[PDB]
Symmetry: D2
Subunit: 260 residues, 4 copies
């Protein structure tokens, strides 16, 4: 019997086998959890159905986080199956491509800013509100994924740094709001990982190489390591932890300047 | 001859004599600066004309930061008078009243989130872009006002904490973008001060009293103290400082728990 | 088979059943670890022998961290039994009583400062160096215990805040030094817990009550929660994490001001 | 009449014209302050007498901060001339050369640790206590110099990172202790500057070059910029600021990864 035997988690953000959300699903399922999944649009439905089947789940629901009604409906549909949930994993972020490529001052337009914040930060708050009744029933938790571009300037990131800073403050405000219900709210700040987000981004290889040289462990992290940290934060072993941004970046954030 | 003799600053955010922006204007003008001002809507025009006259200025322009064209036009109009600017002070923030009163998870709706971030965070980026040519001409600086609800949960603040976290990351991304031009970008994180924002907010008195008990100096800060810190950050004496969030809160942020 | 089956850990800092180190021992042993223990002086030997027996261990060695030779000898003796170690837990701190009671400026004498730093911060570095060969053999990890008085002023703490800040920087420098060997180095920043340290300290009850009111979870943490977080950081599930200060304080650190 | 006309400051840490303390002295004197100086040992006396004369001062006293009696005596001697002081500047740090050159775990011995902390951190606390009566008389302030190796790993720094972390916590504890008297306590975290400390350190040039590439302003800071920031923090314009670590590093600390 695994650490999460008898427990239930909703996973939002699987896109491919490289997704952080996929690695999190694998780890939770490995420890005995039953899973449910959302997909962002109809074009992704069949792929997400396939991924869910890999984890023995047929609980798959549409959820475009741009749309209030879809968030509400995803949780209403989930509630037909589950009378309570042990956790909700938010592994969702987006900014228009143009905002991430070029000089910050020049390229950060209002709509680009709006979208980055709406999809990457507000959506976690909206999902927390929609999930609240199911979370209350089992004193379940919330988890999101952030990146240290929130706290220091990182390359090719621009307005996403603003949106992740917003998200991390959201983690804290949610933790204070929902803590009275026994609901913990945390984030993982992952080091860079090749996922669908990096596809066609020529500079990603160079950034990974630079990360590998700076990180104290002298290597890049994996979705398995992020997945295991997520497993921990979603488990009874993390019952004393809320409002926390846990860095899973092989120590990169702790270095100010590396030798060479 | 004052520290800012021959220098020029645009001040966005005067609403009343209690405004942080008013205290900043007073300090810059005291040290010899020539000033220009924006007003948010027609109802505020005559009041802002009056305030500007107090500082010997007739350079007063409309600028609703919700509107791209108005931001652009304010700087085009300013450029008819000034061929360069030594600094731009952004003292602008807003969230709908309902978002600041009640449980964070329950009250933080999408539009409330959007407005808080658009007006309180994005607007600084937009103003920086519009101001860039005038700032380049004199290697001028940018300054904004933030609050420590970005970093820790503060009462009656909710989504504004997310928006200020976004703003502070914006300070850093702007500093990296504009630093090559010699343009510094900083913020002051002010302790709580009674301004128009607190009018009719019953709990504000209690929060000020609590601040006064916790702060190492055992008193609340004033717009004169914030104004003098702004003067410093807008002056040649701060030429080595960029991307900085300077706390002017009588040390409040440094205390984890106070005796009694 | 537990998560730590076949693994070996040295635990320094058991004093009583209330000790943080005792809770950590319980959790590691629960998951299958074999344990070894140190004791600070002869008066504690029999008690530590008894505690070790509770965890099926007869590996008990003297180690007063004030004495270079004792640190070296403890690891030389351990190496007669173990050809490698999966982790070393440092749960050791001390400052003279007079330094923790009264006005910081008045009571912080040179010797009090020296002792606080020597025992609470330097000792972790010394133990890391002495443990290095055994840690290298299994790519084992290091863990220490810190308190958030390092980052913000906490009551009845004084020079211990300086010593914990030193310790946390030590975590980072150790992580960068030992990371090349695959050795991770982390800390837990625990919320306040009643242990032997609080015995006879009249104000401790009031501080716990205040913690309970501020913390988002509205309760105080336990050595079981700290123990489980330690288990995580000492396990393969934390392989992506080094140089990290993980807060296990029920979210206390995330709150700037609480309602009432 | 300068900003500091009629005000008095004690400067501890002048060694050569490159010293940070020398740049601070220049700025305070430029704005009308009367100055006093300490020297560490007899070999430095004549040089410090000469520097003091450059600022129109004959108030020069021995003060080896390793020795309790010398700290006390320096302030007793100063009090024969001054019935109150507006500020005390601590620009003193040291670690044995061997501790700063090589692998942190290998080279950080107990005595090296002890000295680094005693001279670089404890001495500020001791000087604050000795200065308290003179500071109380004018509600004067305290200022120290720190480096961001406290918060992130910086090269060729090792135990000094621990000692600066200790010092910065000391700033906070002092601010809480002395704030009731109206005494502010702050630090400047300076970017790297060539001073006597770098003489014969071959790698310093490379570290400066790396700093210059990363910093948002794309240049290194000077003692004039540090001096002007110190002037600010020692002036009435900073009356709202205590417990603060002000970064004067051309924005270096705000960057996580630079392009190339
Ligand atoms: N990969 C990294 O290096 C890295 C580092 C730190 C944090 N993160 C964060 O991890 C999370 C997962 O990203 P990933 O790297 O796994 O990439 P990914 O593309 O696999 O996952 C991103 C997910 O966001 C979903 N999404 C985007 N817009 C949406 C919408 N409107 N409605 C619903 N879902 C929507 C996508 O469909 C996709 O499933 C993101 O928040 C990302 O910022 C990634
Ligand atoms: N007063 C405090 O306790 C405190 C503490 C820290 C930071 N701040 C920040 O200081 C800044 C000034 O606030 P204040 O306290 O002086 O209150 P205020 O009401 O005097 O100033 C707020 C300004 O924002 C302007 N504004 C709002 N929406 C706008 C729009 N669409 N277009 C243009 N201008 C718009 C208002 O017109 C007003 O001039 C804000 O960013 C606020 O968050 C205030
Ligand atoms: N209890 C709390 O609220 C709390 C909160 C955060 C961190 N901490 C830290 O947790 C750690 C454990 O403390 P605890 O609360 O379990 O109390 P404790 O008294 O049970 O453990 C303290 C240990 O330090 C050991 N120690 C002291 N001087 C020593 C020396 N010279 N040589 C060897 N060992 C020595 C003591 O013998 C004892 O075993 C300490 O670092 C403490 O600062 C405690
Ligand atoms: N130069 C840098 O890059 C840099 C960066 C950040 C902070 N700092 C800090 O600035 C401060 C000044 O250093 P600097 O770079 O001007 O070098 P410096 O050598 O000019 O000044 C160091 C001072 O410390 C004094 N000192 C050392 N041991 C002493 C003792 N026992 N008693 C009395 N005085 C003693 C020295 O005599 C000297 O006056 C130090 O705290 C240093 O850590 C320097
Ligand atoms: Na960019
Ligand atoms: Na609230
Ligand atoms: Na005290
Ligand atoms: Na080193």
């Amino acid at each position: 019997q695994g650490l999460l035997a008898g427990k239930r988690f909703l996973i939002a953000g699987v896109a491919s086998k490289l997704s952080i959300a996929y690695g999190i699903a694998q780890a939770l399922h490995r420890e005995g959890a039953e899973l449910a999944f959302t997909y962002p649009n109809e074009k992704l439905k069949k792929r997400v159905d396939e991924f869910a089947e890999q984890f023995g789940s047929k609980l798959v629901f549409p959820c475009d986080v741009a749309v209030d009604a879809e968030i509400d409906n995803a949780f209403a549909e989930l509630a037909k199956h589950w009378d309570g949930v042990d956790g909700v994993v938010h592994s969702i972020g987006f900014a228009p491509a143009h905002t991430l490529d070029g000089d910050f001052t020049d390229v950060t337009d209002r709509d680009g800013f709006k979208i980055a914040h709406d999809i990457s930060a507000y959506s976690f708050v909206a999902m927390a509100r929609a999930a609240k009744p199911l979370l209350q029933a089992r004193q379940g938790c919330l988890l999101t994924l952030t990146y240290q571009g929130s706290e220091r300037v990182m390359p090719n990131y621009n307005v996403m740094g603003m949106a992740k800073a917003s998200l991390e403050a959201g983690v804290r405000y949610l933790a204070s709001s929902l803590g009275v219900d026994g609901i913990r709210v945390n984030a993982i700040s992952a080091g860079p990982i090749r996922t669908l987000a990096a596809s066609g981004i020529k500079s990603f290889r160079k950034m990974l190489d630079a990360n590998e040289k700076v990180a104290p462990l002298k290597r890049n992290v994996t979705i398995e390591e992020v997945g295991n940290a997520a497993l921990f934060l979603c488990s009874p072993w993390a019952s004393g932890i809320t409002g926390e941004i846990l860095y899973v970046d092989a120590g990169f954030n702790t270095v100010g300047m590396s030798q060479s």
